[PDB]
Nucleic acid binder design. Structure first.
Lengths: 136, 63, 386, 17
RNA sequence: GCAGUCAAGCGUUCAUAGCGACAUUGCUUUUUGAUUCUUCGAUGUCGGCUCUUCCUAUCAUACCGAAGCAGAAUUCGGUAAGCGUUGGAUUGUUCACCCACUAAUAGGGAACGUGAGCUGGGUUUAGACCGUCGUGAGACAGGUUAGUUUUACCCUACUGAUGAAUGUUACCGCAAUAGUAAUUGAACUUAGUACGAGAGGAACAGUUCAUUCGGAUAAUUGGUUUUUGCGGCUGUCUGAUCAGGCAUUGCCGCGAAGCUACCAUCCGCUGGAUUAUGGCUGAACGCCUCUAAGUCAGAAUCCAUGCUAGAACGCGGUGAUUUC
RNA sequence: CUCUUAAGGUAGCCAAAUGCCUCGUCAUCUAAUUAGUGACGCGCAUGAAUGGAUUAACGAGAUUCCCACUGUCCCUAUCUA
RNA sequence: GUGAACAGCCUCUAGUUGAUAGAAUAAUGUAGAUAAGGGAAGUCGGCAAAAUAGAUCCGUAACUUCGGGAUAAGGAUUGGC
């Protein structure tokens, strides 16, 4: 998160460390995002920085249009395959890992989101919820 | 609270029990335990598993 | 030279030595400070850890996202039968510390208390406290002269209580004796309160109440000899490591030519005395009232014991205390619940907790039913019953 | 004598230079 | 490598807000030399991994003092080692340079910490190639490729565990001493308020979470299957059905119990005394001055509260104490 | 032009196992590359049976990248003999 | 007998039941294994391990000494009656 987040996020179980490849959920032209860093992560020896649902990450584009590649850009994780526990008590998990390309402030590069969007990510990023059709 | 029903078997799901699966398009599944989730993951049909509620309705069990 | 990079210390150095406890009953090292204005009351209680279940309740926490929303929390169930006062003890102040002065016992002691004093009770003549009972055969001057000494001296007064082991499903048959400090005023009234309570039982609701933050004192579940990987959480060696990889590579430098006390070494894990604090009470149940597991929102007629009873423990038939969170020690272990030593006002306390549902499914597997009538309604009829 | 007790030839062990 | 002294000058004017020439006084053994004192009837050698502790010449965090400091942001200085100081591409590397996160990515010591702890990539035997040099054998602090890493069962230290003797035995306690722990950020509100021409733009109190660390726990979730618990499948064998043997646990699906996971949950206390410093009264020195006597407030500091162990030569209370 | 000399590196090839300087310069590969590859050549000290150059197939040879796969790892846990 | 098979596996004839035992199931080992999410971020280096695997049918590139490359790469099917 960091800047542009409207509130705090309860801890979601980490499933995406550095080096994970997740799908691209918006129509920015990218096909997948290669996560290289996680914003707001800690500093422990030998521990990889891991991401969760709603976290803001810095990622590159491996497949997609040639003008979106070979450059680092912020991304927001909207789907998670690792099961996490809500405070309601349900253990839920999606079918795959997906993310959307955003600016440092929080505005999305695209305009529409394919597939569902987690409820914790929609509350933290208002503009993600505006472009998301169905939530969980 | 609210008591949900299992999508695969059909048993009651009390709060805290079981897991929840979301398919890619929009669908939300609920399972009572890992036995129902593993059978669903193997693409098994609930109408052929003899202990499910959907099995009993089709084969005129109970009544 | 420097390490290569700075890393945090593995483990806590204040919990040393990690040796086996001297007894199965953990000691109460500290008691709440006395307030002379408050009435005479107990500071702690003794119970047995039954197990754990799940509670659904409304969260009342302004400024939070789950406000006016339901959450699930894990709670512990501790069976707390009423304890019986068997004696009092007085402590005078000395420049070397606190010193016991006079112990006065009750006239009649049950066989549970006498079981504690013998290791071969089946072979003994059961002669314990036989000549001491002759002190009550007179007018009572022998006990009163030992009781009037506690009013003059002995600025600290503690009471002797024991658990009713025969009211629990345990097959241990021997009471646990312990000292509980009395917190009130007017030291003379402390020994008058203890004198009236000889051979009398005090319940658990007279000491604790709803929404009270208490401390749990018990002995950790034992695990025997353990390696350094699990005892301290050190990093595992690579697969290429000869002569084993579940070890510590460097145990010290050349100088000083000794192994330091601050390095991680293998040894005994578990069976230590621990003191966990800030535990909120969720339910103060009764053993003489049915539908302990019922709630004003559930209304179904059911008690707190799960289907088939608690695993490795049995069924609850006495008063119980439900504590949110985890408690050190496993099931069937004697525990000591103690009131907080300070007034907490962090808004995590001071809230009134009202439950909505108590989970009572079987803990012997993936239970699907709460009550035996629910199993018969869902499954209809079977071959065995009909 | 045998395959053990190695001291002499070495890749990075004793008896170097 | 680091720190002073003097102050010609810079700094719009103004030496010391901050720098500062020409000179001069020291400190350090984390560089490299100089020396050859110890070791050649052997002290196993570079780097990395792993792990503990210590130093302050303080990168961040705490509290303050100055600025050519309006706010914001920053620089300099003081008390301070309590607590932290990362994930990667390249190179055997130390060193270094970039990508990125972060409150911050400070410098070092412990036989250039650490090979009966590991690894063997570098260097440094024997094989082989190239270039240059040599008539030649061969040479190269030149390049390249391949090359056995032995032993603890002894003593001490350390981690745990028993134990004789204090009339006997049993129960309940006291606390000498030793150890000790929590840490940091964000958001809401304060408030688009103080401040400022504008542009911009805080803080105290309060609330909600999170980072790292620690102690426990298994209700739930996940993992683990010799429950060989149930079912299924292949080959072969007991004439067939049934029921089973064997295939170094035959294989597959589910799988309680137990164990376990920031991959699950819970929890992690508040008083006193002080450093820097800011004050009060008030002399010395009729005045003036936080200091000289006295006294107040004051830091992640110290000591206690609390937490862990219980001296096996520290102690107290109490029960029972044998007749062939 | 010209020194010396028996004659002065031709065809090819290269920071290649051969380049001291050097982590050479440019391009490509990566978010980031002293690695790899493609080029540049006054090459300390490349070069023609000291064989030069190019090569399909072959290799328990020496290297770089990609896909798949995985407890190598994040971060360890459990079971059997 | 299974199968392409003198492979592995089970059985008949024949031959052995001989390797010091008993009791428990701590740590660390040797040997064999399984792991959610990520998929080489580990490491000098994909070391080790995992994945692929038989048969039938389809399909098969650059390059080449025209012989190869080739099981290239990449897909589908497999029981019983």
């Amino acid at each position: 998160s960091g800047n542009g987040a409207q509130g705090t996020k309860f801890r979601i179980s980490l499933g995406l460390p550095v080096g994970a490849i997740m799908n691209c959920a918006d129509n920015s032209g990218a096909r997948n995002l290669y996560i290289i860093a996680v914003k707001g992560s800690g500093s422990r020896l030998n521990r990889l920085p891991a991401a969760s649902l709603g976290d803001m990450v810095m990622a590159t584009v491996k497949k997609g249009k040639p003008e979106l590649r070979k450059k680092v850009m912020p991304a927001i994780v909207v789907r998670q395959a690792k099961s996490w526990r809500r405070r309601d008590g349900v253990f839920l998990y999606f079918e795959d890992n997906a993310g959307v390309i955003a600016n440092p402030k929080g505005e999305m590069k695209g305009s529409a989101i394919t597939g569902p969007v987690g409820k914790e990510c929609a509350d933290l990023w208002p503009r993600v919820a505006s472009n998301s059709g169905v939530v969980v | 609270m609210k008591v949900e029903i299992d999508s695969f078997s059909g048993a009651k799901i009390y709060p805290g029990r079981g897991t929840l699966f979301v398919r890619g398009d929009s669908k939300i599944f609920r399972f009572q335990n890992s036995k129902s989730a593993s059978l669903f993951k193997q693409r098994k049909n609930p109408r052929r598993i003899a202990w499910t509620v959907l099995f009993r309705k089709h084969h005129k069990k109970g009544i | 030279s420097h390490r290569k990079y700075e890393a945090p210390r593995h483990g806590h150095l204040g919990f040393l030595p990690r040796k086996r406890a001297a007894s199965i009953r953990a000691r109460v090292k500290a008691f709440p400070k006395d307030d002379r204005s408050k009435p005479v009351a107990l500071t702690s209680f003794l119970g047995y850890k039954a197990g754990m279940t799940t509670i659904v309740r409304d969260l009342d926490r302004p400024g939070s996202k789950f406000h006016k929303r339901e959450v699930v929390e894990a709670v512990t169930v501790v069976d707390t039968p009423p304890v019986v006062v068997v004696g009092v003890v007085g402590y005078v102040e000395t420049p070397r510390g606190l010193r016991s002065l006079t112990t006065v016992w009750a006239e009649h002691l049950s066989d549970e208390v006498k079981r504690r004093f013998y290791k071969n009770w089946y072979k003994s003549k059961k002669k314990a406290f036989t000549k001491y009972s002759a002190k009550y055969a007179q007018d009572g001057a022998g006990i009163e002269r030992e009781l009037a000494r506690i009013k003059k001296y002995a600025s600290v007064v503690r009471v002797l209580v024991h658990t009713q082991i025969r009211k629990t499903p345990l097959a241990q048959k021997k009471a646990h004796l312990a000292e509980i400090q009395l917190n009130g005023g007017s030291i003379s009234e402390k020994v008058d309160w203890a004198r009236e309570h000889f051979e009398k039982t005090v319940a658990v609701d007279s000491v604790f109440e709803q929404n009270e933050m208490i401390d749990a004192i018990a002995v950790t579940k034992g695990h025997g000899f353990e390696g350094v990987t699990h005892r301290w959480g050190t990093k595992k060696l690579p697969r290429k490591t000869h002569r084993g990889l579940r070890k510590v590579a460097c145990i010290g430098a050349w100088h000083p030519a000794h192994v330091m006390w601050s390095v991680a070494r293998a040894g005994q894990r578990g069976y230590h005395s621990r003191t966990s604090i800030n535990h909120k009470i969720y339910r103060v149940g009764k053993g003489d009232d049915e539908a302990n597991g019922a709630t004003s929102f559930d209304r179904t007629k059911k008690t707190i014991t799960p289907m088939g009873g608690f695993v490795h423990y049995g069924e609850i038939k006495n008063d119980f205390i439900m504590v949110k969170g985890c408690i050190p020690g496993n099931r069937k272990r004697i525990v000591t619940l103690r009131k907080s030593l300070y007034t907490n006002t962090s808004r995590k306390a001071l809230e009134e907790v009202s439950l909505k549902w108590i989970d009572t499914a079987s803990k012997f597997g993936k239970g699907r039913f709460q009550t035996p009538a629910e199993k018969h309604a869902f499954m209809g009829t079977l071959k065995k019953d009909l | 004598r045998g395959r053990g007790r190695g001291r002499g030839r070495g890749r990075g062990r004793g008896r170097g230079r």
